[PDB]
Structure 1
């Protein structure tokens, strides 16, 4: 059980020695903006060399996988199989193929061109893609809320019209409320657009990304992993740490991102055990030592 222990010395070595695999969140962990965490590529190099599986779990729904993979090599993370990378965009598309109801249905998407590429790559028909001949607009059977920078009250109204049908799915890529920018400003996240959609429609979204356990289901379609033998490394307690707890993983908080150690200990004193990390490190560069 999580007691927010600084991960070091012999403990660090046993924890890493025993682990078969590490799941990493990206922003606030491997990098912040245009800047790699110094020593982060070297940890990834050293884990591969130790024969430990590294995978990446992101709530990003802005970019399709091939462009998400770009960011890795660009910030010094070479040698990555794009199969190592799981985003809310990819997993939302998979979940939609799995669950889309109706006869052997179009998805109305709140989101950008990257998200759309991803959904189409999975065989999904999107509302507002061109119609066959001059036949009817296909029946909309899911509403997907992603990171939509061009969100408007009109799209909100349209989403709710589709959701009047109770057989129409409501799905969210993630519930991230906001995102820190390099210049100290914040950007609204998908969770804020999902809150608007949920309120106006009176529905609860099915959530794809962390802390939803479905993100783990998604990862373990392509890979067997023993979550008991898997570390989850993230910077955000309500997302990455909570997720790791829900999956039965050992959790590690890195202090290079959103959450402060102060908050992690707050929650422990308040006995909120699934928002408490098992370990914390100043930065993931402190983990290389144990290898």
Structure 2
């Protein structure tokens, strides 16, 4: 990984070789309400050229059917729900897999998060602490994007975690997210930091840069990481994810991370946070096909 500007012959060969492309969404395909011009067209040409496209998002705020809506709304047609992987969806699968209880009863998840996250969990067959009883033992605390996080919920989370057998899981560690108006919103990472600190515990992280998301993806699809491009705007999330999975990484500059940070990490020899290539926007990739 030497942070090279991807163009000309090298672009045609890298894309030529590529069997598939995994895309982050926010900062890559769009910023809020606005699609990156040329992004829908890249996805079209990818379909026409080979070449698998899958989407990997740390979003834990909406269930998959609703996250899928953003694609159509922002002018990305022809996409199937099964191409989209979110930390919400993957958290539900991890909990189902890891679940410490006796076989019935495995049992309940205390969730810090919203209705879309809850809907995903229930759909994976998971029992939630907030739900109507027929009170089950809580065997996992899940920290997701919780716009209604409170000291009270934090305190309750810690009560459950006093049981060392109770799992602590976080959907992702993203510290904050940019909004259209130039402001930020705190991210799950900030809520996970509070929970870990007060409980004295380290969370299992579901989303990027955890390799679990790639396991979650490869459950459903055969992807050869050596032949797959990982495209993202956040070095510490998307690019680190790519290196950990053995993918060729492409930083796009339409999002959170700056070229200057990528080059800084290169100089400090922190090669897992350096992309193989960068582009100003993913529209620069299309001419490679």
Aligned with 1:109 (options 108, 111, 114)? 111
CA distance in 2 between partners of 1:75 and 1:123 (Å):
32
For structure 2, which runs of at least 5 residues remain unmatched after alignment?
A: none
Give a deviation string over 1:151-177, Cα, whole Å, max 9, x none. Answer: 000000000000000000000000000
Considering only aligned residues, what root-mean-square deviation do their CA atoms show, in Å? 0.5
Residue 209 (structure 1) shift: 0.3
SS in 2 for 1:220: helix
Residue 30 (structure 1) shift: 0.1
Residue 272 (structure 1) shift: 0.2
SS in 2 for 1:80: coil
Give a deviation string over 1:192-241, Cα, whole Å, max 9, x none. Answer: 00000000000000000000000000000000100000000000000000
Give a deviation string over 1:12-43, Cα, whole Å, max 9, x none. Answer: 00000000000000000000000000000000
CA distance in 2 between partners of 1:48 and 1:35 (Å):
22
* Structure 2 length-normalised TM: 0.99
* Structure 1 length-normalised TM: 0.98
CA distance in 2 between partners of 1:141 and 1:32 (Å):
37
CA distance in 2 between partners of 1:286 and 1:216 (Å):
26
CA distance in 1 between partners of 2:72 and 2:155 (Å):
40
**Superposition misfits of 4+ residues, deviation over 2 angstroms:** none
CA distance in 2 between partners of 1:254 and 1:128 (Å):
40
CA distance in 2 between partners of 1:194 and 1:141 (Å):
17
CA distance in 2 between partners of 1:181 and 1:81 (Å):
27
SS in 1 for 2:47: helix
Residue 254 (structure 1) shift: 0.1
CA distance in 2 between partners of 1:68 and 1:121 (Å):
15
Residue 128 (structure 1) shift: 1.3
CA distance in 1 between partners of 2:127 and 2:14 (Å):
45
CA distance in 2 between partners of 1:65 and 1:7 (Å):
32
For structure 1, which runs of at least 5 residues remain unmatched after alignment?
A: none
Give a deviation string over 1:119-167, Cα, whole Å, max 9, x none. Answer: 0010000001000xxxx81000000000000000000000000000000
Residue 97 (structure 1) shift: 0.2
**Alignment match, 1:54:** 53
SS in 1 for 2:136: coil
**Alignment match, 1:11:** 10
SS in 2 for 1:118: helix
Residue 246 (structure 1) shift: 0.3
- State how many pairs are aligned: 286
Give a deviation string over 1:41-80, Cα, whole Å, max 9, x none. Answer: 0000000000200000000000000000000000000111
